[PDB]
Design a protein around this ligand. Sequence first.
Ligand SMILES: [Mg+2]
Ligand SMILES: [Mg+2]
Ligand SMILES: [Mg+2]
Ligand SMILES: [Mg+2]
Ligand SMILES: [Mg+2]
Ligand SMILES: [Mg+2]
Ligand SMILES: [Mg+2]
Ligand SMILES: [Mg+2]
Ligand SMILES: [Mg+2]
Ligand SMILES: [Mg+2]
Ligand SMILES: [Mg+2]
Ligand SMILES: [Mg+2]
Ligand SMILES: [Mg+2]
Lengths: 196, 184, 140, 159, 110, 107, 55
Amino acid sequence: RQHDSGVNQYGLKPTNAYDYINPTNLINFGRGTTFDNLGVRRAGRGEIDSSPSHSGSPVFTQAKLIGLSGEEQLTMCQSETMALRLCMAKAGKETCERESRALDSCLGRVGHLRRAMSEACWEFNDWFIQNVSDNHTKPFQHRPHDWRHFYAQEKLVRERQQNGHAYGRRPKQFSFGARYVKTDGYGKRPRLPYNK
Amino acid sequence: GGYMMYHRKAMGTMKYSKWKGAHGGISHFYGRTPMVEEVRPNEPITLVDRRIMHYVHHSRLRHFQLFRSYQEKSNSTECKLREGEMLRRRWHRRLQKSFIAFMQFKTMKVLEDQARLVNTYGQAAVNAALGDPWNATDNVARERKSAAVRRQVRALPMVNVVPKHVATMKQIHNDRFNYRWRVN
Amino acid sequence: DDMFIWLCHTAMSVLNPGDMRSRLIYNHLRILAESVASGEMTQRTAFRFFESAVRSPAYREIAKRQLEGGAATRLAGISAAADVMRRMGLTRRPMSSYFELYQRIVERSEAMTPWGFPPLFQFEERLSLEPRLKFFSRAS
Amino acid sequence: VFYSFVLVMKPRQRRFTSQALREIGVAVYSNGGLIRSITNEGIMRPYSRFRDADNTPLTYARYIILQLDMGEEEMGKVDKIIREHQDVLMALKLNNLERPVGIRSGNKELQAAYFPLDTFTRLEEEINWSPQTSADIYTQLEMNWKEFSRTRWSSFLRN
Amino acid sequence: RWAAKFYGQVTFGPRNYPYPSSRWLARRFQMKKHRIIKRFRFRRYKLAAVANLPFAKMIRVGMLPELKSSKTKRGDVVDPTLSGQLVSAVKNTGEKRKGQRTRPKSKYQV
Amino acid sequence: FDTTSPAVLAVKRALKCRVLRNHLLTNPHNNIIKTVLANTERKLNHALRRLRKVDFKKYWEIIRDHDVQDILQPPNLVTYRQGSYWKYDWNAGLAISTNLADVMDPR
Amino acid sequence: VKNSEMTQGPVDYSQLDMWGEMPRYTSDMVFLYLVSRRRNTYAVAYTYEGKRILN
RNA sequence: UAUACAAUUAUCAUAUUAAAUUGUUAAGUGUUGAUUUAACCAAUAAAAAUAUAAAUAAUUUUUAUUUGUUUUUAAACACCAUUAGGUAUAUGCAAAUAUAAAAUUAUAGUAAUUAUAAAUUAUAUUAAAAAGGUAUUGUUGCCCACCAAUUUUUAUAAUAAAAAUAACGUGCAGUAAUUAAUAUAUUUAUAAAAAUAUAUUUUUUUUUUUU
Ligand SMILES: [Mg+2]
Ligand SMILES: [Mg+2]
Ligand SMILES: [Mg+2]
Ligand SMILES: [Mg+2]
Ligand SMILES: [Mg+2]
Ligand SMILES: [Mg+2]
Ligand SMILES: [Mg+2]
Ligand SMILES: [Mg+2]
Ligand SMILES: [Mg+2]
Ligand SMILES: [Mg+2]
Ligand SMILES: [Mg+2]
Ligand SMILES: [Mg+2]
Ligand SMILES: [Mg+2]
C-alpha cells in the first residue's frame, strides 16, 4: 500500500491495550512531531527528537567524536604555528614570510579536510541510526541503580560468608588512628559486621 | 588545631600559626613527593608545569585529589559517584568502538579511492604525486628532501591546555572545571 | 514497487539460498513474489517463508561440498529474481523490472555492512525508518 | 624458608652491630630454632627517613636479612624481642614463604597436587627474585640443575 | 530491637515495584511516625521491664506518681520497693560518669 | 582408610570442638566461629549418639578422654518428656541394631 | 631465555639504582615554595639548611 | 447472611553450612605573621598503609548464639553549640527487610477504600539535536502539618489514642520545588520539620583501556 503498516490514517496504529486507554500516545511524542513523523519516532535532523540512542540514552556528542569542535579536538597544524610564533618572538631585524607561507598552505588544505570529516560523520549518524540505535527503546545502562542486580550479587556473597545473615551490612568505620589509640582488650581494627 | 596537608586550613599564616616539619633541603616532603622533573637545559619551566598538569588532569588524579581533599563524603556517595563515573565510561567506550568500527570503513573507502586513482594515472605517476624523488639526479637532492622531512619530524614542544578550576559558592564540587550542573 | 525491495532482499540478504535456477526453489520464489504483490502476505512473512522453504535433505552437508563459509554466488539469484518479475506480469514495460532490481543493489554496494540488516527495520514492523534511510528504497 | 625478616638497623660502630646481631641470634637459639642464612648488606639510603631510639631522624641505615626456622608459637617471643631492640629501626616479616602466591591455583602444578616441600627446601632469594637477576641465571640454573641431579644419589648412598 | 521500625504498612505498592516503598507512601507514614515519636518525647514517656517479672507487661514509669508529668491524672500503682528502685534508676541514668560508655542524652530523658 | 565411620567422626569433631573452644576463650568476639563451634557440636552430638548404638565402650572412653558429656545432655525437659530424645536412634536406624544374644538372653 | 623480557649480558647499573632518577642537591640551593590554594596563593623561599629567607 | 488462595519468578521486620579472629605504625620549628569561609567568631599544626591457603556435603542449635549505639583527648580532624565548653565511632545492652503472604486505613469494631512508572510540560555552548510534574485545557496547578467547634469507636500518657471534618490563624514542608529527596539511627522543636551518622535513587549524565 501507500505507507507504513505501523501507522494508519489517524496516527500510529494502536496495538497494545495501553494505546486504547491512552491514545495521546498515538499522535503526540513531542514538539518535533509531524504526521509523517509518527512511527518514525526520531524526527528529521537538527530537529527536536532527532537524536539517535545507544542502549536508551541519546547520543548528543557527535562532533566531539570526530574531533571537530571539542576541547580534546584534533589539531591539524601545530609545528607550523609554533615555528611561526618562534620567528615572531626572536628578532625584528629579519622578517620571515616563508613561515607564514608554509602555514597558510597548511590552512588552505585544512578547510577541505574538515568538510570531509564532517560529511563522513553525518554518514556515521545515518549508519548508527540504521544498524545500531534502538530509538530510545531499551533501559538506560549508564547509572549505577540500573545495575542494582549486579551489586546485589555481591551483597549476597558477603552475606553467605557471614553465615547468611547481615545483608547490606558493612564494617563500622573506626577512627583515623583507632589501632594505636586503643588499650589492650578492645578491638583495634574493624571486624566483619556479623562478628561485631 | 592539627590539620592534614591537603586540608583547607592546612598551612596557615597568622600570628598564632606556625608551619610544621623541616621545610627546606631534606624536608618534611622527603619521601612524600609525587613528581620530580630535572629541568632540561634551556627549557622554560612552563612546559614542564603544563606537562605535569596535563598528565595529572587526563588521568583524573587532580580530579580525585581536589575531590577528596575538600569535603567529607560518606562511603555511599563516594561509591555512587565512582561507579557512576565508571559506568558512564563503559557506555561511552561502547560508543567509541562503534564510531571507530565505522571510521575504519571510511578509511577503507578512502584507500580504495586511492587505488582507483592508481589505475587511472598508473602507479608510478601516483607515486610522483606523493613526493617520490624520481627527479633526484644525485644524492644532494635526496639530502635536501630528507633535510626537509627531518625539519618536519622534529617535534616542537606541545603546550597542552589545562582546564581552569571553577570556584563556585558553597562548592558542591571542587572538581568543577566547567559551569555545567552536576548530580552530587 | 515495494516488491523490488523484497526481491532485493531475497537476492542479496540470504547466504546460500540453494541453486536458484532449479525449478523447485524457483517456484518457491515465484509464488512468494506473487503473494507479496496483491498484499496476500507480509514482506516479513514471505521472507521467512523463503528462507525456511524446503530445499533438499542434508542441506548443510551438501553445502560443505560447494561452499566454505556458506556464501553462494549471487548471479543465479538476480537472474531468477528478474525472470520471475518478467514471467509474472509485474510491470507494464518489460525492462523496468530488471533495471530496478539491478539499480537498487548497485546503490547499496557502497554502504557499510551492506548485506546485513537489523531484523526489526529490515521489513514491516510497528516502528519504521524515515523514507530516506529505508534500505533498498528509491529515496536513499 | 619457614620465616624471614628484613631488619633495618641503625649504622653504628661495628662492635655494637656485632653485639646486637649476637643478641638476636642467641634469642633465636634459646627459643629452639635455626638460622638458615644471616645475610649482611651495606649502609643504604632508604626512601623514608627513620627515627631511632633518640628520636633523631636518620638518612642512612644498615640492612640485614634474617632467614629462620622456628615454631609459630615461640616466634611471638622472638618477634617482640627483635622489635623491642634499640638498634632495630624497622623489621618486616615474611610468613608467606612456605605457600607463596604463585602456586596451587587451579591445578597449575603438573604431576603433583600442592607439594609443600618444593618451597621449604628453597631460600628466600629464589622464591622472590632480586632486581639484578637477568636472563643469565637461566643459564646457571640449569648447570646447577643437571649437575646436581647427576651427583645426588651417588653422594647420598655413600655413607 | 524493641521499638517498632515502622508504623503501619510502609511497603504497599503494586507487586514487583522495584523498591521497598514509594516516596509518597513513605512520606505519609513518616508523618505518622513523626507525630507518635514527638508525642513520646513531649509527654516524657518512660517504660521499664524488670527481671523476674512478666516481660511483655511493662511497668510504665512515666506515669509513676513521682515522675508523672501531669499534675492531674492518677498515675499508676507500683510496688513501693520496686518504685523506689525505678526512681533511682531513672535518676542515675542521666549523667555521664567517666570510664562508663557514653550514652545519648536529651532534655526529655529527665 | 576409614573416615566416615562413627568412632572416627566423633573423635575428630571432639578435637575440632576443643580447639575452637579455647580459641574463643582467647579472643572473645568472632561470632563466625561461635557459629562454627555450635554446628560442630551438633554434628558431634549426632556422631556420639550413633556410636553408643554401634559400640558403646568406645563411646564411653571417648567421652572420658575428651570430656564431652555436656553435649550429650538432653536439651530441655519438654522435648525429652515426649520421647524425642530417644527418638533420634530411631531415625538413625540403629534402634534394632543391638544383636542381643551376646548380652541379655532374649528368652 | 627465548621468551624472556630480561636482557642477557652485562646490564646497565643506572637502570637499577634507586637514586638514579631523583634530585641531586647542593649546600647552596634555594627552595622556592609556590602553594596554590582555592581562594589564595603564596610563595616562600628556604635555605637548604632549612632557614627561612623572606616571609 | 452461606455460597472453592497460591504452589514457575510476590521487598519491612521468626535469622542458620558458615573462616574468621589477632598485627605499634606515622607525625611533629622556624620565627614576627591577614589563614578558612558566601559571611561571621574562637585560634600551634602535622599525621596512624602488608596476608593467602586450610576448615568437607547433608540429616533434632529456635528457652542457645547473631545483624554498624562503646574505657582512655593528658591525642587530633569532624560534628554541636558560641568569646567560660560538649563531643570526638563495635568488652555490659540491642533478634529482626532480603521476604510464606489472603483488598486500603485502624493496637484486630471507627472511614469505604488505597497504591501505582513509560501520553502531554521550550532555553543545560555539536561540524540547531540529551532531560523532570503529586498537575490532568495542567504552577494564578495541587498538597502539608499544628491552631476551634463538633461526629463516632474504643486498650484513656504533658493536654489520652484513632477516624470523619467545609472554620480561624501561622507559615511554606512536599511535587529533581529556592541548602535534592527517600529509609534507619541520635539530637532538636510554635507548626510543617531541622542538624548530624550511615545506607539509597521511586534525583537530572556527562563519559583517561598504561600519555
Ligand atoms: Mg524531548
Ligand atoms: Mg579543643
Ligand atoms: Mg527521625
Ligand atoms: Mg517473615
Ligand atoms: Mg571516648
Ligand atoms: Mg468519643
Ligand atoms: Mg484525639
Ligand atoms: Mg517548599
Ligand atoms: Mg527539605
Ligand atoms: Mg527541597
Ligand atoms: Mg528524610
Ligand atoms: Mg520546627
Ligand atoms: Mg526526620
